Design a protein around this ligand. Sequence first.
Ligand SMILES: NC(=O)c1ccc[n+]([C@@H]2O[C@H](COP(=O)([O-])OP(=O)(O)OC[C@H]3O[C@@H](n4cnc5c(N)ncnc54)[C@H](OP(=O)(O)O)[C@@H]3O)[C@@H](O)[C@H]2O)c1
Length: 281
Amino acid sequence: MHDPIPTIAFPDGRKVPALGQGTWRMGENRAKTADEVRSLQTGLDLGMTLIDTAEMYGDGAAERIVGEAIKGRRDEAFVVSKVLPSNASRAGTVAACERSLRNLGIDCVDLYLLHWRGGYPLAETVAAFEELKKAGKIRAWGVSNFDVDDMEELSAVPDGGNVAANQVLYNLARRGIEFDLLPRCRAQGVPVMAYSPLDEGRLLHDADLIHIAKAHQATPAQVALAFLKTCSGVISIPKTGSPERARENRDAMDIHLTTENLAELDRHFPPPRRKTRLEVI
Ligand SMILES: NC(=O)c1ccc[n+]([C@@H]2O[C@H](COP(=O)([O-])OP(=O)(O)OC[C@H]3O[C@@H](n4cnc5c(N)ncnc54)[C@H](OP(=O)(O)O)[C@@H]3O)[C@@H](O)[C@H]2O)c1
């Protein structure tokens, strides 16, 4: 019997498991599709109910993978997608949402993000998000790759205070948001979605993570996710094309990092001591 996935509440009171599933680079290889679908199905069965995708991921292909994986079980998934900033005009956003819904094969996304900051004024994009919400086409909107200054601009936008999430880079190797952005979003009640929680796999070569993994009879990936589980206000979205890895990632929740593991990680992966430029992938 494994331990449960902690839950995080959105501003609107909806709760999701703090461990979800990524999909970037899915749907690029026909030979992997069956496994990618199965990986997401496996994570859903195990309670990794949030799935993060985007219009740009394989230009609709990752969305279609998500659509397969949720076939017969839409109500079990919390589907997140995104609009590219070059599409995030008043009419563009609506048109992009409709494509995503067609690809996903569903009526409504749970959460719809601006993927990063572009040249269209924020009020335009938020206006489109609020109309989609009223139309029953999205349930909530948020943003991604927004630093503090970007977050502040939302207050000048009417309805900008409805922001439901900020999806930014965060893992042991990229702790910059701890200085300012994460504390702001926590004070504000806005979940931070930590993308690339395994630093795209680069963390898995780290000797201190390996050592700590060894002590817990776990894997380095499981340790990287166990750390992020300790962080309140954070939802991590690791991606894997492998159903065996999905199971492994789920079981990262059974690790209880000790006070000494945490000190050692802080020593090996130092927190920012000053404001850091937002890292983006
Ligand atoms: N908003 C944005 O701008 C943005 C940017 C980046 C990412 N994201 C989202 O965040 C998700 C996660 O980040 P990411 O995909 O960039 O990288 P990541 O999840 O940190 O790591 C991905 C890599 O780790 C491997 N992996 C996963 N679990 C493993 C395990 N237990 N053991 C060993 N290797 C493991 C995967 O390989 P296999 O697939 O071969 O197993 C994959 O190559 C993306 O899929 C995407 O949904 C959003």
